[PDB]
Symmetry: D2
Subunit: 436 residues, 4 copies
């Protein structure tokens, strides 16, 4: 249904956001390929990550997952049996592409299928480079579409130049070369998420990191690990921006992932002039982690573009909200080179936030967000089934004088169950904090 | 409680429609999907297997509409089979697996097949190797031998195939794959085998050539929509034929039964034994021989069963065994699972008080023997042994308990209902 | 949803129609109440009868059912135990009404509920009389609607007179009478379905009957019977009317129930001068059964009214079709489901027939050839869909029959049996 | 199944434990009888508490619920309609007893049923008093077992005396006495959970207590409240105890409810001397809530019985573990089900601890370092498995715990919260 949302008198307390999706996926896949038991804490246990588990369980690996905790009794490649079942990818694009790399590594036959939606997402960009490595891959629309059949094994390294930049593709090819013979090299136009690169090293593998081109030597051995999964930045960002905007706020998000390739918001917040702080910075993967603390801030407009855009793409709608309370003008530029799935978000956020009373319009390559503007409520705003719009809108409502009806909150409860619960106990602690 | 108590029958009178033929039901649907025009199946077997065949072809883009025993298959040639976005689920059906493979090899896109646990243990390599020799890219578990299998069907070149094994499912696959290949495709085997695929395909407007031991198809001909009235499955029909032959005061008409000689082996044994049997209304529906059989309490003579016949009556050996117990003198049947069948058939009938004995390649039955109840007989989860025992219990003085009845209820749900119906009609006609 | 139906060149063959729904219900119920095993052949395995089985199992009766054969390890009243589960009736009007009577006998607590459909049908007509007999019954809308709660036990016989004519009602009270103290008597306006009467006798209970008045004494035993369920004339009727009208037809329907309170269709056929044979009359458990043979006849219009209407109600839609091919005026009157008559009229009329409704029924006229090429709906009522289907067998140009799911649910093999009849005619000719 | 647990290096952090079961049940129930909307926060979305929601949804009440957040559109008693469905109570004893009360209020027919479990639990101790009030209740075993049928309405108050202490039974009769005529009274040999009284007071109803006897006039009006459900002391107990035992530990437990009728372990903590802070002392929806803070403390053995025992019954397993590390003769004594305590002893001595069993309670002696390397079962009981789990955080070498799949039911994230305290002391440890 809908949620009606009042304005917040304040936000205070500590919160653990649910663990990073990308890291949780990889923590599992890598543990399966490794020798000796891997354990996973802070595991994001959603449909996609549960799909990954199910897939490897069918490949023979003994995995026990109990809420946020996972234990993977890996025995290396030598203990992955040929599946007598179809591997069901569910809704996970991550699982599909990375496991396509891994299955090309294996000297047996496998079939991949997922749901309605995954059968419209093109896979050709990944099957082609893998056929090049010596992998027999056929499927719907000549291997472009689900379902896909795969026999791998005796695989050969490859240098590979790529036109479009994509982290999932990279990760597939890297995992495939992990059991190949010789140099396997990936090259892209943009730099992009390094989770595969980082986590591999924490498992006991060496990668190249050469400028714009990453490479791997097969065949190295993966060992069992103890993986503490960092919080998802994308989920933290909702609270960070709330903490910044909402009067009388002081929020501490613990164990948040700080991977420079995804923590672009943390740079935006800082340059806008947020009272932001990091604490206890570590490297738990692989991945850098910190405890973020924000409190009510006086913000300023900031021009955002270039190499920053690729590193904060999920935080565009929430930054749109944040900019509403910043003095002067903020600009998003170089969004022209974004998927229609993201160009649509921008367009709706623009109109949703306008319904809420802000000065904001769409541009050729992003949006301009103008002035500090008090948001007025007494209106319905829709999440359009996109959890990122719902959530951003949800926190935008915390500033609105008069009630705001956010509809389509179903999509939020799917992705991030306790979003409103966490929000509610920040409002409770702040009300319990004002006493005589 | 998985056991029925079966009392001796005082008589058996009536008419019965046994369930459709499984082989013909499958193919009606399949060849339907390959033809131009509306095929209409009547008396179709709505079992799990045949329902699986329907499903796979729906998943291939073919419009198919099924109620109870009535099927409609709409259009539309090869030109209307679209590349599946779903896994084609074969379920339990060996037939769907094997025949559809032949057909899938004929199509220029990608298909996957899987089934349940059972099908995932049955070796397919016997079919996949031939089709690969025709040009088909077929991979699968255990190097294309076990489910799940993946199929890409390129431009297909014909083949002169030779096989050490006699297999009708294997033959069907290659003939079907030969349908849209170029240049004559031929299968040769040791024994002559079931000929449903050739007959029906022939009735669907296709031409098969037959030079004894070798069958061949010239690609690529058209198939036309047909009205297929599925004939009664003889294996089921056999159980009534035998009961009717034996129990005093019996007379059973069985309407519209597939009479095909590659499976009608029991019809020739009945004749040989001097059973009172009648064929009436024999015609041919959509390639398949069919007539209504009528049988009455007979005076049977022992006979030798062996050679060519065995293939064409294999499934009836258990019931034939019972038929034999009532024939005068010796009746021999000669020529892993077949031997396990034979043994328990022998075992059971023996405690019913028959003189039957097992041999290396079959069994020997002696004389006319009154069967006796008061014993519990088991089917070891074999519907064929179950039913055959059921019928034998109809002869025994004292009651006979037949454990393992749920196997029957799965193959032939209305089997005991049909028996009961004949038992009652005989008591109602006994108004002297 | 639909079926397209062409005219029939002929209909030849034998059919076993499904068990009578009413007898099938009762043989389970009486089996459960009786000492000794009861066995049931020809049982109708539809959703309703299975609900009946479901319920008595929850009362603790061992019942093993497969296709059309039931076994009931009946062990008497002593043998029914207090349910820990809710008794679920699904969609079954019979089960609900009758079980209410039975449960008013049993000295413990029980709860009845059904689906949405039963949850709308009123129960006051049965609950009120049983309450006056001594049973504690409460429920939604002051015991008028499910869920109903019942504590039965020590009942005292009533002399019941009703303004309604209902066999479920009569059966409830008669069943409560079985263990009630003294004499329970039901007097009804019309006479009605007497299956409850005939089967109590077949199970060994002395039931006294004047006309319209039936009485019963507690507390007689019931003995396990072997029950052969007769065919529903309700279904047989579609095939009898089919045989009567379609040229080149010769149909035999085996083991069909001819109970006179329900054989109204036969009276009409015979009065219309149909070529009807009733062979092998028997009585199976107090139930008159016979083999019927019909062949293409030259029917005449007849006047259907008065005492017969009650005996042929469910068959009015099919008789309406029958009258379409009869030579002359045929009147149905003294009827008062009055919307059910009207759809029959509407559809048949757009089929080319010459029907009209009256206030007391309808008037159908002459032998009218029927023109297809048009679409007619069952309106979820299965009987309209089957009447319409066999009407279709007679019509030049095809007829689409909307809502064949309803048919398919209540008579799965109905269209297959038709096919089989048309098939066999092709072979002869 | 089973989970392997090594020793704890140290426990540091802030934790919000799940909502209180009893308050979650009541928030919905009372909200359904109230006039005007009732919003609940901190709701425990367990099986039992969702069963309450189910039941009132079938009584006509519009209720939205999503994870820990619940909205109840109350329209007073007049808004409850006669049910067309059976009221399904699932496995919930609370729901069963407290609804029998509420339904007795209602001038229509209603049927209750639950699982094989509820089906075996006696109800005569609740239905008999309710009938005295004018309620008509029939059911299996002469009103003593599920399913039960009820028609209510015209109710007259009763002076009721119970020979058995039961919160549920008290709650039922009070709830019925909310729409009865005159003064309804309940008197029982001991005093037990008083959540019904507090909540009702908070929803605007006058409950008069004269120690031992509670009484209510009717009909008073219930008004829609904002109800922040406090954390469950029974589940906070497992973290207070672990904190007091593990070397270098300092844990804050946000918004835990401090009801004296269940805060027995807190009295035991301060009597054992353990360092225990108590910030933010406030009363919320009639319930007293506080923020608890425990650090690693020196434990002293203490005598426990009679006065303070009835109000800590569930915590006995966990307190038995807390005594393992307390110096000296620490004994609990009262038998008044108690089969739980029998099993605790077997497993603990198996770990290498000093516990014998006595006529009513048990003896615990000295501070004993526990040894690990054995399998301990909980027999499907969650209160053991949890106590047994946190116990294993002291002994080294794997201490395999069984019945863990029963823990994941009453407390989904128990082992997660636990894990998060170990690994946040990995990150607090940097010079």
């Amino acid at each position: 249904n809908k949620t009606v949302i009042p304005h917040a008198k304040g936000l205070k307390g500590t919160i653990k956001v649910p663990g990073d999706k990308s890291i949780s996926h990889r923590a599992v896949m890598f543990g399966a390929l490794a020798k000796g038991t891997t354990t996973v804490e802070g595991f994001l246990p959603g449909a996609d990550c549960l799909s990954t588990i199910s897939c490897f369980q069918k490949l023979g690996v003994s995995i026990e997952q109990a809420e946020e905790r996972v234990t993977v009794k890996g025995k290396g490649w030598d203990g992955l049996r040929e599946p007598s079942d179809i591997l069901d990818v569910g809704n996970s694009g991550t699982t599909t592409r990375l496991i396509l790399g891994i299955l090309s590594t294996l000297p047996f036959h496998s079939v991949i299928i997922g749901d309605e939606s995954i059968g419209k997402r093109p896979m050709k960009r990944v099957t082609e480079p893998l056929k090049s490595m010596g992998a027999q891959i056929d499927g719907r629309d000549h291997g472009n579409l689900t379902p896909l059949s795969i026999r791998g094994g005796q695989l050969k390294g490859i240098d590979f130049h790529s036109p479009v930049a994509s982290a999932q593709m990279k990760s597939a090819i890297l995992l495939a070369g992990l059991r190949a013979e010789g140099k396997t090299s990936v090259t892209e136009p943009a730099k992009t998420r390094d989770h595969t690169e980082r986590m591999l090293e924490a498992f006991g593998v060496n990668i190249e990191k050469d400028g714009l081109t990453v490479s791997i030597e097969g065949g190295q051995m993966l060992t069992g690990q103890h993986v503490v999964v960092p919080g998802d930045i994308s989920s933290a960002a909702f609270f960070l921006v709330a903490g910044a905007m909402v009067p009388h706020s002081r929020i501490t998000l613990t164990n948040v992932g700080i991977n420079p390739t995804r923590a672009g918001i943390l740079e935006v917040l800082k340059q806008m002039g947020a009272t932001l702080a990091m604490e206890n910075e570590r490297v738990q993967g692989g991945e850098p982690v910190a405890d973020l603390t924000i409190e009510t801030s006086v913000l300023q407009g900031v021009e955002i573009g270039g190499d920053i855009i690729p590193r904060l793409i999920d935080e565009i709608p929430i930054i749109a909200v944040l900019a509403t309370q910043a003095s002067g003008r903020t600009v998003i530029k170089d969004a022209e080179e974004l998927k229609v799935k993201e160009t649509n978000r921008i367009d709706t956020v623009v109109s949703e936030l306008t319904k809420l009373g802000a000065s904001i319009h769409a541009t050729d390559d992003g949006m301009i967000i103008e002035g500090p503007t008090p948001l007025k409520g007494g209106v319905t705003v829709s999440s359009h089934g996109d959890h990122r719009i719902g959530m951003a809108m949800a926190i935008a409502a915390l500033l609105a004088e008069k009630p705001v009806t956010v509809e389509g909150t179903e999509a939020i409860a799917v992705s991030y169950p306790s979003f409103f619960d966490h929000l509610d106990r920040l409002k409770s602690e702040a009300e319990n904090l004002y006493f005589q």
